[PDB]
């Protein structure tokens with residue numbers, strides 16, 4: 430049964446060797462796998478504006494800050510789920526949300 | 528044996544931070560003022576339980592321990608995770624391996640990953656298929672007991688595996704550790720001005 434490929438391109442287009450790939454996609458229980466680089470837009474300061482960050486989102490003005498972080502934070506709120514502080518995921522620079 | 532798990536089983540509840548609050552939550556935790564079992568580093572590798580994540584620590588500075596032995600039945604018919612101290616990279620392999628009465632290093636693969644005066648204080652937990660790495664490397668001064676004091680734990684790495692809760696063996700080398708378990712207790716924490724845990728209180732203690 431293991432007669433081999435006849436890749437001798439003296440034929441027409443129907444017998445040609447093609448660099449093929451087979452994307453086989455199925456689902457298991459562990460998410461957050463290979464996904465897409467969603468185009469990474471700019472920033473803005475000192476004007477109220479909609480924003481979407483890596484999971485959390487809101488709308489307001491983005492300005493400077495005196496509060497400090499550590500190597501792990503992605504979030505910030507003063508009291509009672511009022512989100513106000515984001516160190517940005519590109520410049521790694523701390524901001525406030527008024 | 529047993530010692531007093533004073534306060535030090537406490538970590539940041541998620542990748543997630545407030546500042547200067549008194550916030551409450553619930554997760555699996557080491558309860559305060561409980562017994563915590565003490566063991567030796569003779570020459571052994573005894574049999575210890577593993578109850579839904581552990582608080583682990585040891586007093587060392589000279590690379591006695593080498594990692595942890597995971598696997599649902601631990602005899603090369605298992606989906607076994609491995610942790611290897613290299614002195615270069617804490618590497619993680621999810622394969623099948625052969626284990627003995629003393630499997631260590633001294634003087635069907637599916638996942639791969641590459642990264643006394645001190646306490647290397649680690650907490651592993653496995654919620655919803657997510658294996659998490661909660662750590663603290665702190666310096667101390669004495670050797671025989673966990674000190675009357677305070678510590679916090681920080682995250683390192685999330686890993687989706689989902690295999691082990693019953694038991695284990697562990698890793699040593701030729702040339703003393705703390706182990707205490709988790710249970711769901713509603714708490715109350717404190718973030719400081721910096722948003723680090725400085726003190727907390729177990730609700731169901733007294």
Ligand SMILES: *[C@@H]1O[C@H](CO)[C@@H](O)[C@H](O)[C@H]1NC(C)=O
Nearest residue numbers: 528529530531561562563564
């Ligand atoms: C462990 O806790 C039990 C329950 O109170 C206690 O009786 C026992 O003495 C403790 N262990 C040690 C070594 O004190």
Ligand SMILES: *[C@@H]1O[C@H](CO)[C@@H](O)[C@H](O)[C@H]1NC(C)=O
Nearest residue numbers: 602603604605606623635636
């Ligand atoms: C692991 O590899 C062995 C080859 O020795 C094979 O017999 C077995 O089916 C494989 N899978 C499991 C789950 O053991």
Ligand SMILES: *[C@@H]1O[C@H](CO)[C@@H](O)[C@H](O)[C@H]1NC(C)=O
Nearest residue numbers: 611612613614615616618641
């Ligand atoms: C660390 O990484 C791997 C795992 O042992 C090994 O190839 C490498 O040589 C190690 N580095 C050492 C032992 O210095």
Ligand SMILES: *[C@@H]1O[C@H](CO)[C@@H](O)[C@H](O)[C@H]1NC(C)=O
Nearest residue numbers: 495496497719720721722723
């Ligand atoms: C927390 O922030 C204040 C800012 O005034 C600083 O004085 C203090 O040392 C910081 N604490 C830590 C542990 O970094």
